[PDB]
Structure 1
Amino acid sequence: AQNITARIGEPLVLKCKGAPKKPPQRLEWKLNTGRTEAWKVLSPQGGGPWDSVARVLPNGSLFLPAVGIQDEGIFRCQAMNRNGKETKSNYRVRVYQIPGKPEIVDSASELTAGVPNKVGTCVSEGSYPAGTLSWHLDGKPLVPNEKGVSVKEQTRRHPETGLFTLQSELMVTPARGGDPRPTFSCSFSPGLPRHRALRTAPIQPRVWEPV
């Protein structure tokens, strides 16, 4: 049943299939989401508190002003022409949100070519879903296990807004006689196959020999 993604706090319209543009219409909207467990059905326009959340338009389509988190789920619409021609619609809804540009904090301007050093802590604020936080070296990706690399990831959730926060502190051990001018960048990339990663502005500290 058709996959659908929509940004939280935006609007969204679900076109009821085979329904006449202006009443009389024989339509029905079922919906399974966070706000209703399991199924709820709506009457046309009225004083009920659902006309702020999701209501049917003259067009016949269902329309929600502010898609939120609790609106992830399943939306069904069964329609009827005068002749009886059934035409149904099965909408699977998932909601997303892009977080602020990934800034680095606690960064370091100089590091030694001897011991592991903390490069910095990457921070992304207000996402959905969480998604990864990958560090990069000279435009190329890096691997946490080897060589002489470490990563200290994390993930929170704001109890109110339901949005996520990610932290990815890095640590490296520069190979002796290696490049004194590395170049590090972090990035947020959601799991979906659309939005590109949000890179951070590259930092490039220096690798001094110890003594």
Structure 2
Amino acid sequence: TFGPVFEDQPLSVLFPEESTEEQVLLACRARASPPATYRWKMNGTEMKLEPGSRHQLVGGNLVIMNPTKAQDAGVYQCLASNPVGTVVSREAILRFGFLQEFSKEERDPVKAHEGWGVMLPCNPPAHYPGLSYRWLLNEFPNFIPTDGRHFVSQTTGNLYIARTNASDLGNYSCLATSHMDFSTKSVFSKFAQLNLAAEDTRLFAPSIKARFPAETYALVGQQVTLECFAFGNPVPRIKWRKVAEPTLQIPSVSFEDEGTYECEAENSKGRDTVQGRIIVQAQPEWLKVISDTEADIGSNLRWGCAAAGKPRPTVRWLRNGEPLASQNRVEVLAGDLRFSKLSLEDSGMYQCVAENKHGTIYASAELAVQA
């Protein structure tokens, strides 16, 4: 006979607001002898799963009836125990995917001058997760092309023109698109009128008005997009370097791509520059983990775990899914479990828990003290 070994664990779920399914599963199972009983935790609080209930346990599996952001969004964790002891699953995040439509309330007039640079605000509906942004001239689907006189941000979704013309006269609408697992959804706004008053004849050294953060935090492998677009006359040219498009794309980052990046808006009259720093981070991943150990009574044990990733993660310890700190019999150091002479009250499940700002991983094993 033996203690619980996880055969499947809950993974984070993006339940789309809408949906046909009137429920949401969070999987969990463990092989154990005798058969393993299950418990659940939400946001750190334990779950009441009861008879005539809405939070239903189906043999290890958590099934939540009619889920809502306002009631169900959060962090869930499975707990698998039997006479031998408890182990705890990875945390799974339950999030809700939605996109509202723009207000049927008309847009604020945005009037500028010909030759002047002008920004048109998207100001988009409530949404999760992040969106694509395109803009529309007069009708649908009459798209604005991104060419250098035009720029649509993928943060704010605001349209930018560096210099206005006679060709830019018309009505404008922001089209927000959400991409999720089984559905794309595009919503667009009421049409704002761009009025263009008397032509300015003057020239302006470029001013960057679409910047990118002082610092940008990304994981290894992530796509990275820094935005840099500038007002100016004549139409400024975007230049990038490490210390020719307005957005610098990094298809998959390695650690080398860390450092200060510089954007140069430069027309013939001057140059505006902007500097930001990319920090390359990484998830905790298991370098070494504890194994099911069979030990004699009164013996000693050197147990250990270590994890990679930036920043260097912190190794916790759990006994039967309970925060373990150093105590009479047991010694604790970062990722080290030293048993100063074993008792039978040690025969249980143990886990090491490595974690940083980016994630928390788990590794478990059974201790069996024998005579």
When normalised by structure 1's length, the TM-score is 0.56
Match of 2:236 in 1: 25
Match of 2:337 in 1: 170
The letter for the 1-side match of 2:330 is V
The question of whether the paired residues in 1 share the 8 Å contact of 2:293 and 2:368 is answered with no
Matched, 1:9 2:221: yes
Match of 2:277 in 1: 92
Match of 1:179 in 2: 345
Could you tell me how far 1:138 is from its partner in structure 2? 2.2
Q: Which runs of 5+ in 1 are unaligned?
A: 33-55, 154-167
Question: Paired residues, what number?
Answer: 158
Equivalent of 1:150, from 331, 336, 339? 331
The question of whether the paired residues in 2 share the 8 Å contact of 1:102 and 1:187 is answered with no
**CA–CA distance in structure 2, aligned partners of residues 189 and 15 of structure 1:** 31
Match of 2:305 in 1: 122
Secondary structure of the corresponding residue to residue 147 of structure 1 = coil
Could you tell me how far 1:187 is from its partner in structure 2? 2.0
Matched, 1:108 2:273: no
The question of whether the paired residues in 2 share the 8 Å contact of 1:3 and 1:93 is answered with yes
Equivalent of 2:261, from 75, 100, 103? 75
The question of whether the paired residues in 2 share the 8 Å contact of 1:135 and 1:141 is answered with yes
Could you tell me how far 1:171 is from its partner in structure 2? 1.5
Could you tell me how far 1:180 is from its partner in structure 2? 5.2
The question of whether the paired residues in 2 share the 8 Å contact of 1:111 and 1:117 is answered with no
Match of 2:315 in 1: 133
The letter for the 1-side match of 2:320 is D
Secondary structure of the corresponding residue to residue 217 of structure 2 = strand
**CA–CA distance in structure 2, aligned partners of residues 129 and 170 of structure 1:** 22
**CA–CA distance in structure 2, aligned partners of residues 134 and 180 of structure 1:** 18
Secondary structure of the corresponding residue to residue 139 of structure 1 = coil
**CA–CA distance in structure 1, aligned partners of residues 267 and 306 of structure 2:** 53
Match of 1:63 in 2: 249
Please identify which structure carries the higher strand content.
2
The letter for the 2-side match of 1:139 is G
1:116-170 CA distance string (max 9 Å, x none): 423x33244x5334322222222222234x43333566xxxxxxxxxxxxxx442
Secondary structure of the corresponding residue to residue 203 of structure 1 = strand
The question of whether the paired residues in 2 share the 8 Å contact of 1:18 and 1:81 is answered with no
The letter for the 1-side match of 2:280 is V
Change (3 A) 1:95 1:61: same
Change (3 A) 1:83 1:147: farther
Change (3 A) 1:68 1:19: farther
When normalised by structure 2's length, the TM-score is 0.35
Could you tell me how far 1:101 is from its partner in structure 2? 4.7
Secondary structure of the corresponding residue to residue 143 of structure 1 = coil
Identity %: 22
The letter for the 1-side match of 2:294 is S
Instruction: Spell out structure 1 runs of 4+ moving beyond 4 A.
Output: 80-84
**CA–CA distance in structure 2, aligned partners of residues 19 and 135 of structure 1:** 55
The letter for the 1-side match of 2:309 is S
The question of whether the paired residues in 2 share the 8 Å contact of 1:102 and 1:186 is answered with no
Q: Which runs of 5+ in 2 are unaligned?
A: 1-212
